[PDB]
Design an enzyme around this catalytic site. Structure first.
Site, PDB file in Angstrom:
ATOM      1  N   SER A 110       0.783  -1.246   0.000  1.00 47.09           N
ATOM      2  CA  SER A 110       0.000   0.000   0.000  1.00 47.09           C
ATOM      3  C   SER A 110       0.818   1.303   0.000  1.00 47.09           C
ATOM      4  CB  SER A 110      -1.016   0.016   1.142  1.00 47.09           C
ATOM      5  OG  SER A 110      -0.369   0.201   2.389  1.00 47.09           O
ATOM      6  N   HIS A 159       2.269   6.481   5.456  1.00 49.69           N
ATOM      7  CA  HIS A 159       1.202   6.875   4.552  1.00 49.69           C
ATOM      8  C   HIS A 159       1.612   8.122   3.764  1.00 49.69           C
ATOM      9  CE1 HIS A 159      -2.702   7.762   3.025  1.00 49.69           C
ATOM     10  NE2 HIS A 159      -3.333   6.934   3.841  1.00 49.69           N
TER      11      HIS A 159
END
Ligand SMILES: *P(=O)(OC(C)C)OC(C)C
Ligand SMILES: *P(=O)(OC(C)C)OC(C)C
Ligand SMILES: *P(=O)(OC(C)C)OC(C)C
Lengths: 175, 175, 175
Positions: A110, A159
Site C-alpha cells: 500500500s 502513509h
C-alpha cells in the site's frame, strides 16, 4: 495486457501470500521483514521485501487491484523503468517511516499504491499531454483506500511518505 | 449480454439465497443438500442443487462475479451446451469429494467456478485460436479466490476436483 | 466522465465520512441527522443530509459504487436535473420512513441507490428507446445489495420507499 513489471510484482505477492498461508505469517516475516536485528542489516532485500507480504485476503486484493490498474497504466504509458523507480523509492521510504514509528513487523504494497495514486493524479492535472490521469470516479475510491489507511480502518507518517514520493515524482516529471 | 445459462444460474442462486434468508439456511439445506440420509438417495436433484446455496453475502457475490464473467464468456464463445456440461460435471464431482471428506452439509457455486477457472486458463494457453483465454491480471485474482478456498480463509480434495474437471475438459477440447 | 451532480455527491460523502473518522460518528450525526428534537425541525438540511453519512468502509464503498454507475448514467443520458429530483425525493421519503420505524439515528446513500436501481431497471424495460437500462448481470448484483438491505445482512419500509420512488418515477417517465 499487464506489462512485465506490473505482472511480476503480482506473482511475487501471490507466491509470498501462499508461503504465508503454508508456513505462517511470522515464519515468512523472519525472512522478508525490514531488518529487526543488527545481524540482519546487510541483507539488503529486507529494505524492499516487506512490501510483498499481505496479512488478509482483502489486504492483498485491494493492493493488487490498485497496483494492477495504476502500475499497469504507468508501465504501459511511461515505461517499465518508471514503474520500477516509483516502486523502489516508495517501498524504501514508506518502509523506513513505518518502522520508525511502529517497528519492523509490517508488510504490504500500500505504500507503493499510495505513491502510484499521488503520482497518477498529480501527473494528470499538471501534465495532461502525458496521456496519464486519475478519473474523477477513481479519485473518490482512491481516497477511500487512502482514508482506510489513515484512520486504521499503517503509521500515517509512512502513509504520507508513500503519497509524498508519488507527488514529488509527478511534480518533477511535469517539469 | 449474459446468455440464458449464465443468466438462469444467477437467478436460481439469488432466489435460493433469498429463500435461505426467509426460511433459514438449514430449512433450505433440508431440501437442496446432497443426500444426507438413504431415504433421499433417489432425489437426483440433490446431486446438483447443493451448488445453488450460499451462506453469506460475500460467498454468493464472488461466486456470481466469477461465474458471470467466466461462464458468460464460455457460453458466448463456445455455446450454452459447453457451459451446461462443465457445470453439471464439476458440481457432481466436487460435491461428491466435498461430502466424502466433510459430509453433506455444504453448498456453493465455487466448485463450478474453479472448473471454469481451470478450463478458461488451460484453453487459452493451449488453444489460443479458440478466442478464449484468462488474462494475466485475472489469473492473479482467480488464484486469490482459489487460495481463499484451499486455506479455508471447502475440502481441498473437492477444490482439486473442481479444478481438475476444468483442466481435463480444457485438455480434451484443445485436441 | 462523471457529471457535476454524480461527482459532487461523491465528494460530499467522502468529506463527511472523513469528518466522521476525525470527530466521531455521533458528533457528526448531531449536525447532519434527521431532526431528533423539535428545536431542530426548521433546520431543513437535516431532511436530506442523513444520506451523506456512512458508518463503515463497505457502506460508503458499495453505495458510492452504485451511485457512481447508476447516478452517473442517469445524469449523462437524462440530465443533471433528473438525478437531482430522484435524489431529493428518495432521500426525503426513505429518510422519513426510516425515522418512523427506527428513529432519527441513521444515515447512508442506499435509499437513493435503491431508487436509482428501481428507476433504471423499470425505465429500460418500459422505455428502451431511452438509451437507459439495467443489464442482466447488474440486475443480479443490484438484487444482492437490495437483499443485503432487506434482511439486515434499514427499515424495510424505507427500503420499499426508496425502490417505490424509483419505480414511480420511471413509470411516469415511460409515459
Ligand atoms: P499497506 O499495505 O495497507 C494499509 C492500508 C494498511 O500497509 C503498509 C504497512 C504498507
Ligand atoms: P465454494 O462455493 O466456496 C469456497 C471458496 C468456500 O464452496 C464449496 C463448498 C463448493
Ligand atoms: P443504506 O445506506 O444502506 C443499507 C443497505 C443498510 O441505509 C439506509 C439507512 C439509508
Amino acid at each position: 495486457r499487464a506489462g512485465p513489471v506490473t505482472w511480476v510484482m503480482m506473482i511475487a505477492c501471490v507466491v509470498v501470500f501462499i508461503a504465508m498461508q503454508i508456513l505462517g505469517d511470522q515464519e515468512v516475516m523472519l525472512w522478508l521483514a525490514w531488518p529487526f536485528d543488527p545481524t540482519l542489516k546487510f541483507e539488503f532485500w529486507r529494505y524492499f521485501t516487506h512490501a510483498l507480504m499481505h496479512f488478509s485476503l482483502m489486504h492483498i486484493l485491494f493492493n493488487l487491484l490498485w497496483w494492477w490498474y495504476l502500475g499497469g497504466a504507468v508501465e504501459k504509458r511511461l515505461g517499465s523503468g518508471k514503474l520500477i523507480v516509483i516502486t523502489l523509492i516508495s517501498a524504501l521510504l514508506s518502509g523506513y517511516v513505518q518502522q520508525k514509528f511502529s517497528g519492523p513487523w509490517f508488510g504490504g504494497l500500500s505504500g507503493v499504491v499510495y505513491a502510484l495514486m499521488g503520482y497518477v493524479w498529480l501527473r494528470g492535472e499538471r501534465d495532461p499531454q502525458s496521456g496519464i490521469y486519475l478519473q474523477r470516479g477513481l479519485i473518490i475510491f482512491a481516497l477511500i483506500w487512502i482514508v482506510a489507511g489513515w484512520f486504521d480502518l499503517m503509521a500515517n507518517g509512512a502513509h504520507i511518505a508513500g503519497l509524498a514520493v508519488g507527488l514529488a515524482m509527478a511534480f518533477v516529471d511535469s517539469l
